[PDB]
Amino acid sequence: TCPFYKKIPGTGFTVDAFQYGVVEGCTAYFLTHFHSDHYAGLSKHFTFPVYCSEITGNLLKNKLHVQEQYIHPLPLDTECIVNGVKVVLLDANHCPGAVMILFYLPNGTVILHTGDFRADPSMERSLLADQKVHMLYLDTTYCSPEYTFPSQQEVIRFAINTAFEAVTLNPHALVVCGTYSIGKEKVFLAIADVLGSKVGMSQEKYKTLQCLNIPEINSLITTDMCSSLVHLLPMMQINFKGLQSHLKKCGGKYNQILAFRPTGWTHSNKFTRIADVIPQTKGNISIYGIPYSEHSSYLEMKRFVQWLKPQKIIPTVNVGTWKSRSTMEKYFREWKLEAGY
């Protein structure tokens, strides 16, 4: 049965709420982005209206085989009406096609649902600036002060310099990037760009990238592994076994692998600057752990919330346990007392 935090009060609307069968009273199902925990339950068998970004709709059509009649894509940054309610979709700075949703309720209440997001200062000069927001449905993935991480740009610069040096040193080395969902594409696109290469990958992965409205994408990606010095593999294969095995498959065309594993936070973020990072190595294979986050750090989340000054916060992540809920309520209370709302 559908939880309160996926319901929008005073509408027939739900968010990211497809795994409970038919939700009684729901007249429109929003989907914030194409990640499986959020789309869970959607299939070609779904026959109610789904509202989402154009990218998310392309994915729904092509990967999930949801029928076109049920897919209602909306442009971003544009005031639209849905079932007689005014709504706006905003860029979430998460994965391709991910959005936050602004609901302007008939009674005059304004609600922001962040979906999944990485808070940024640019969000402070959006349509959010134009009026008070009363309720915030918040991505609390890293809502604890230990969660720090570098900027996406620091990480990319690091990846670029590292790959360029290794391949200029050994022109027969192969660059491999690990992947499991959409998101974090800039890792492999920036590396490929500095090496003058396309990125090679499986047919299933190519098909996914072809739905994302990336400019000039046909000149950036290919299913011909032979013709490419940056390859994508499933994240599960980024280990010394998987990478040796892959190296055998390429027909001796390369004699070395340099691999990247973009992770979230893991415990060593507590000490190490990006400049100090060093790989695990076994022989002619070297693996780098890089902390590329598409969720807010604790400090990013705190700044956004203290700017927005909402009357109520409703978490959407880590809600299944009392300890978690209680911990998060303590931070929200500190933030409020500090900022004076």
Residues within the interface to Ni ion (CB under 5 A): 35, 116
Supply the minimum distance, in Å, between the C-beta of residue 107 and Ni ion. Answer: 31
Which residue, 116 or 300, is less far from Ni ion as judged by CB? 116
Query: Is 42 exposed, middle or buried, given 0-12, 13-18 or 19+ CB atoms closer than 10 A?
Result: buried
Radius of gyration of the chain (CA): 22
Supply the minimum distance, in Å, between the C-beta of residue 197 and Ni ion. Answer: 28
Q: What angle do CA 266, 294, 38 make, to 5 degrees?
A: 100
Q: How many Å apart are CA 214 and CA 74, to the nearest integer?
A: 18
Supply the minimum distance, in Å, between the C-beta of residue 199 and Ni ion. Answer: 22
Which residue, 36 or 107, is less far from Ni ion as judged by CB? 36
Give me the residue label for tokens 């602004």: 102
Which residue, 256 or 316, is less far from Ni ion as judged by CB? 316
Q: What angle do CA 274, 280, 285 make, to 5 degrees?
A: 120
- β-bridge mates for residue 100, sequence order: 90
Which residue, 98 or 173, is less far from Ni ion as judged by CB? 98
Which residue, 116 or 185, is less far from Ni ion as judged by CB? 116
- DSSP letter for 84, please: T
* C-beta of residue 296 within 8 angstroms of C-beta of residue 139: yes
Supply the minimum distance, in Å, between the C-beta of residue 316 and Ni ion. Answer: 11
Query: Is 190 exposed, middle or buried, given 0-12, 13-18 or 19+ CB atoms closer than 10 A?
Result: middle
Supply the minimum distance, in Å, between the C-beta of residue 297 and Ni ion. Answer: 16
Tell me the H-state helices in the chain: 36-39, 54-62, 152-169, 185-194, 203-209, 240-249, 298-308, 322-339
Which residue, 36 or 69, is less far from Ni ion as judged by CB? 36
Residue 27, CB-side half-sphere exposure with 13 Å CA sphere: 8
Which residue, 96 or 310, is less far from Ni ion as judged by CB? 96
Supply the minimum distance, in Å, between the C-beta of residue 185 and Ni ion. Answer: 14
Residue 154, CB-side half-sphere exposure with 13 Å CA sphere: 12
Which residue, 38 or 302, is less far from Ni ion as judged by CB? 38
Q: How far is CA 257 from CA 75, 227, 261, in A?
A: 41, 16, 13
- Phi and psi at residue 103, to the nearest 5°: -105, 125
Supply the minimum distance, in Å, between the C-beta of residue 115 and Ni ion. Answer: 7
Q: How many Å apart are CA 290 and CA 15, to the nearest integer?
A: 31
Supply the minimum distance, in Å, between the C-beta of residue 139 and Ni ion. Answer: 8
Which residue, 180 or 341, is less far from Ni ion as judged by CB? 180
Supply the minimum distance, in Å, between the C-beta of residue 92 and Ni ion. Answer: 9
* C-beta of residue 290 within 8 angstroms of C-beta of residue 261: yes
